[PDB]
Amino acid sequence: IVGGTASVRGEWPWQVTLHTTSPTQRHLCGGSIIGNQWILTAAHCFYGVESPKILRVYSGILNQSEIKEDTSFFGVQEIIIHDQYKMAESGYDIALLKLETTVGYGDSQRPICLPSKGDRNVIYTDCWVTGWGYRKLRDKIQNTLQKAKIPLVTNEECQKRYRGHKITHKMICAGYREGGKDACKGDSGGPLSCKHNEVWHLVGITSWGEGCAQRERPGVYTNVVEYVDWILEKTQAV
Numbered sequence: 001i002v003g004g005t006a007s008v009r010g011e012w013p014w015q016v017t018l019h020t021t022s023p024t025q026r027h028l029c030g031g032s033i034i035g036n037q038w039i040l041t042a043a044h045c046f047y048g049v050e051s052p053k054i055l056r057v058y059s060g061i062l063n064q065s066e067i068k069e070d071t072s073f074f075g076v077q078e079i080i081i082h083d084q085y086k087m088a089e090s091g092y093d094i095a096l097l098k099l100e101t102t103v104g105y106g107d108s109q110r111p112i113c114l115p116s117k118g119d120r121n122v123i124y125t126d127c128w129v130t131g132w133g134y135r136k137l138r139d140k141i142q143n144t145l146q147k148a149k150i151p152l153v154t155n156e157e158c159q160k161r162y163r164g165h166k167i168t169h170k171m172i173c174a175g176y177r178e179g180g181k182d183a184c185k186g187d188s189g190g191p192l193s194c195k196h197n198e199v200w201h202l203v204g205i206t207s208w209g210e211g212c213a214q215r216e217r218p219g220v221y222t223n224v225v226e227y228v229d230w231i232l233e234k235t236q237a238v
């Protein structure tokens with residue numbers, strides 16, 4: 001996260017840190033708890049991931065230093081990537097992790113509400129991007145979960161900012177015209193959380209941008225409201 005500040009413990013209890021174990025253990029991506037065996041994240045996170053056996057989901061983490069060999073985690077039973085996904089820049093950048101065991105909800109780990117289809121018209125004015133990602137293009141994973149408040153940008157303005165790309169309505173953009181606050185390397189897969197009527201909603205999934213926090217280059221997020229039926233298809237299968 002660029003231009004962000006340290007989160008407080010329990011502030012983003014749906015935020016997870018997804019680690020890979022191959023070749024050595026390191027943070028891979030962010031994710032959000034959406035159900036008691038379900039993590040919503042970005043499809044591009046699994047580039048070169050040949051098996052869910054190398055994945056570890058850590059919930060209830062503020063500091064990466066809380067993670068050692070004796071720290072509990074959730075194993076991943078299945079990786080579900082949207083089957084129209086090709087690359088982050090073309091959209092469909094969404095994946096589900098089916099966990100091997102159930103998350104016990106509490107004040108340190110609990111789900112974020114998905115957006116309502118009826119609320120595709122609501123204007124979100126209180127949106128935050130969170131993660132342990134870089135603070136600038138050449139940096140390192142941060143110990144403490146960071147947060148940054150960022151305004152949503154219309155599809156029309158985002159398209160003007162990304163000449164040569166096709167910014168679809170399945171993408172949602174967020175950033176200041178002057179830049180300064182954004183997601184960066186290591187934040188992808190994490191949430192873009194917006195508070196509306198005292199309820200937090202998973203509005204976006206951190207996906208891509210041209211550089212980090214650059215002037216007139218908003219961060220591009222998977223527009224979660226456009227995938228609610230796809231999520232229910234995969235999580236509520238009979």
Ligand SMILES: COC(=O)Nc1ccc2c(c1)NC(=O)CC/C=C/C[C@H](NC(=O)/C=C/c1cc(Cl)ccc1-n1cnnn1)c1nc-2c[nH]1
Binds near residue numbers: 027045187207221
């Ligand atoms: C010690 O542990 C580490 O160093 N881990 C460790 C360290 C680094 C990384 C990983 C693991 N994860 C991956 O490589 C998985 C595969 C993932 C690809 C892409 C992913 N992109 C982002 O996270 C965000 C991009 C992004 C998003 C928005 Cl909204 C705006 C601007 C963005 N940026 C443009 N340029 N940079 N950011 C990424 N993540 C990293 C590098 N790039």
